[PDB]
Design a protein around this ligand. Structure first.
Ligand SMILES: [Zn+2]
Ligand SMILES: [Zn+2]
Ligand SMILES: [Zn+2]
Length: 178
């Protein structure tokens, strides 16, 4: 196994996957690394199994169909994995915890949103469709772009949204387009 967390790239108290060489801090893995279970398989491994069991699940899909899917166990997992792929980028730090808004010439968003809030919402099974999860993720970046206006810091929101969107297209096998 690797000697650093796959998500945050630090050493520490690491749990090792049994079916691949990745390792995780307990609360870096999503869902949080399960108490017992030997062997244990990480989210990466679980997602690869879904694909292998249903190879056709990689054929292209329309986003509108994906968003309307109910949050059954496989869709729950895919959203957890997509959330985790965002936290894998170090720039996710800016969007992880609850924000506050006091900048001359801007007003804060009507509906603040942050990664740890989405993480809790997933854990508590608060989303009934993929659309709920995707809307909250996209709201994070949209709030950031609107608030920061012409400050160059707006770019961090574009950057992390691009990581989200690429991974959304991969994980949910969205049909490729120009
Ligand atoms: Zn970690
Ligand atoms: Zn694994
Ligand atoms: Zn099949």
């Amino acid at each position: 196994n690797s000697n650093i967390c796959e998500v945050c790239n630090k050493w520490g108290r690491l749990f090792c996957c049994d079916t691949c060489p990745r390792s995780f801090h307990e609360h870096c893995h999503i869902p949080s690394v399960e108490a017992n279970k030997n062997p244990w398989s990480c989210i990466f491994c679980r997602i690869k199994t879904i694909q292998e069991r249903c190879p056709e699940s990689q054929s292209g899909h329309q986003e509108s169909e994906v968003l309307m899917r109910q949050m059954l166990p496989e869709e729950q997992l895919k959203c957890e994995f997509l959330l985790l792929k965002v936290y894998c980028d170090s720039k996710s730090c800016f969007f992880a915890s609850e924000p506050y808004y006091n900048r001359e010439g801007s007003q804060g968003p009507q509906k603040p949103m942050w990664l740890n809030k989405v993480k809790t919402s997933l854990n508590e099974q608060m989303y009934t469709r993929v659309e709920g999860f995707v809307q909250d993720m996209r709201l994070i970046f949209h709030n950031h772009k609107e608030f920061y206006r012409e400050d160059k810091f707006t770019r961090l929101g574009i950057q992390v949204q691009d990581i989200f969107e690429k991974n959304f297209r991969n994980i949910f096998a969205i049909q490729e387009t120009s």
